[PDB]
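Give me the 3D structure for peptidyl-prolyl cis-trans isomerase nima-interacting 1.
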Amino acid sequence: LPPGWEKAMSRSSGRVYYFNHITNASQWERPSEPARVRCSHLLVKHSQSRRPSSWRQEKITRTKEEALELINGYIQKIKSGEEDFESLASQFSDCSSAKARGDLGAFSRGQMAKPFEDASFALRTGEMSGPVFTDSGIHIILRTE
Ligand SMILES: Cc1[nH]c(-c2cccc(Cl)c2)nc1C(=O)O
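Predicted structure for peptidyl-prolyl cis-trans isomerase nima-interacting 1 (145 residues):
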């Protein structure tokens, strides 16, 4: 199985699934290193972010755990096809990258916060992370190239 990926048992269903401890991705389907990758992300900041401020809201008051709830909801809507990643990022990301549908451009190792970087580099093109925690807040990351 590729980097980060492990088999787990579903506690609701009893079926095996796969989890990635690097990107916090999880899926039923069995899965599945570049010098640069290109990603977009959606950031939900909280009261404990390094700067609890954004273009959406001057003073970010939500708790870390309320932020995780928002992230989980967005992942649901992306996975169900109810909303697409780009649209939720444009509307709801606390990163200024929201204005470019969450697109950050290409980057190499040594540039991003390590949890983000490691998540980005362990995704394959087209793959989406689960909740990824950094000092900025909580991200969902989409590897586009
Ligand atoms: C507004 C913003 N974006 C990011 C960011 C953007 C891309 C990757 C990572 Cl790790 C963090 N941090 C912030 C912040 O204000 O802390």
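Residues 85 and 112 are 21 Å apart (CA to CA). Let me know if you want a second pass.
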